[PDB]
Amino acid sequence: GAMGSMERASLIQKAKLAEQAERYEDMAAFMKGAVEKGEELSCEERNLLSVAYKNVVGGQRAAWRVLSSIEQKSNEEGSEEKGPEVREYREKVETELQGVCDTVLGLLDSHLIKEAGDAESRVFYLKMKGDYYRYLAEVATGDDKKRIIDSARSAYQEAMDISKKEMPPTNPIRLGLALNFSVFHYEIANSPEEAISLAKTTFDEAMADLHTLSEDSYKDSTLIMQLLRDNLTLWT
Template sequence: MDKSELVQKAKLAEQAERYDDMAACMKRVTEQGCELSNEERNLLSVAYKNVVGARRSSWRVISSIEQKTEGSDRKQQMAREYREKIETELREICNDVLNLLDKYLVPNASQAESKVFYLKMKGDYFRYLAEVASGDDKKSNGSFSFSLKCVEVYGSPRCIKGDTNLKG
């Protein structure tokens, strides 16, 4: 399927509220390696925001149930296992988006507006990872170091000069 067909299919998936399909189409568009148009960029963002949003909402509900479950070890175990399943899905999706950002989107962004959009998106997906991380995972999954780097860069005069390179 060529790029225009994938974009059209993503639009259809959006209308049908089938965000997993929409994300799959836009992932394939992104993996073609070309810079995305504003419309394509927004389709990608909407798709993954909805895919992740559903899992984040599910995670919050199940986490609350798990914390409130008293007495029954079996019920608590079932809630924990289900929460862990959702966490795994959420991590996979977030890592998928972060890989697209690192491999294709940020490197191919020729305009500052696009680069800022993608870097904000990157921060959002690290935040989503951090929301479900526990203990030492919060520091080891990259979200902590990326957040520190953002504070360092955007709190410095480099930001005023338009330097959006967060790698160094």
């Protein structure tokens, strides 16, 4: 742990600095150091963690897609043989992506999830576990692809069950988890109908609970509801 000698509060301070500087790899390294101090994360600290890794893996995913599309093109009838470089470099980016996902899942498994007893922390980490298995599923093509998909599904499902029992239908974590699990169905599990039904039911139950909110909670909730509707528009 290169971050072993830095104060927990100093790691969190530098995480926020790296965020402002758009240095998300640094941000991620600082938050991994913080998690490895062994203490539970507060709400704000969990969000620093997810923000850091979302941006790192988000750039890796965008590169991987660019390289996949090139590689698939060099495989069309009538493409000129280019040698192994496109596949090699796609594999390099792909390996590095998987290593980031393995790092995040390692943090959840040692020991974020097992200590998370409040709904807000447990659902948040289970959502993350589903997301990072989903990112692994997007590049999976092997013996393990089914089990990686089922790992995503299983994490999302446990997070759904707790969120339905313990949080109001407008809770932003509950909404974001539903949004992502609905994308999992559409994009990964080949179940566009489940994806549609989940996004529609989530949207409509949140709608009917907006009346209970303050104006700031209303903003946070309708922001994510709009993403559900944008997906529905995309899919229908």
